[PDB]
Amino acid sequence: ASVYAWNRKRISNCVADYSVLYNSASFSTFKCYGVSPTKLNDLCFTNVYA
Amino acid sequence: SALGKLQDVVNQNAQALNTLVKQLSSNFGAISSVLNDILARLDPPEAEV
């Protein structure tokens, strides 16, 4: 979607392997602010939104 | 209220201890008030801050 009408998708009731996101080199920018990229596989979350 | 003088000392000590423990729940401008959450959520360069 466009930036004025950005698409928000809810992520819930799933087990997420974030290691495929860190190890992929396809992303020019992979920058996290409130959480470490390498610790994402060790924590539990709710209210995940993309 | 006969024994108010002892009760004031006991109340002041308990209140000071209670406030001291309550100060642990304040983040003081950090992202969280829990150290374990910071250790589990961040890398050492931001964790030191």
The verdict on a CB contact (< 8 Å) between B41 and A39 is: yes
* CB contact set of A26 (below 8 Å; sequence gap of 6+): none
Instruction: Give A11's DSSP letter.
Output: E
CA pseudo-torsion sign A7, A10, A14, A17: positive
- Are A1 and A42 in contact by the 8 Å Cβ rule? The answer is no
In units of Å, what resolution does this entry have?
2.9
The answer to whether A32 contacts chain B (CB < 8 Å) is: no
Q: Kindly tell me the sign of the dihedral angle through the C-alpha atoms of B24, B27, B28, B30.
A: positive
Residue pairs between chains A and B whose CB atoms are closer than 8 Å: 17
Q: C-alpha distances in angstroms, A26 versus A38, A41, B26, B49?
A: 17, 20, 40, 31
The C-alpha of B41 sits at a distance from chain A's nearest C-alpha, in angstroms, of 5
Cβ-based contacts of B43 with chain A (< 8 Å): 36-39
Report the structure determination method. Answer: cryo-EM
CA neighbours within 13 Å on the CB side: how many for B38?
13
Q: Chain A residue closest to B32 (CA)? A: A34
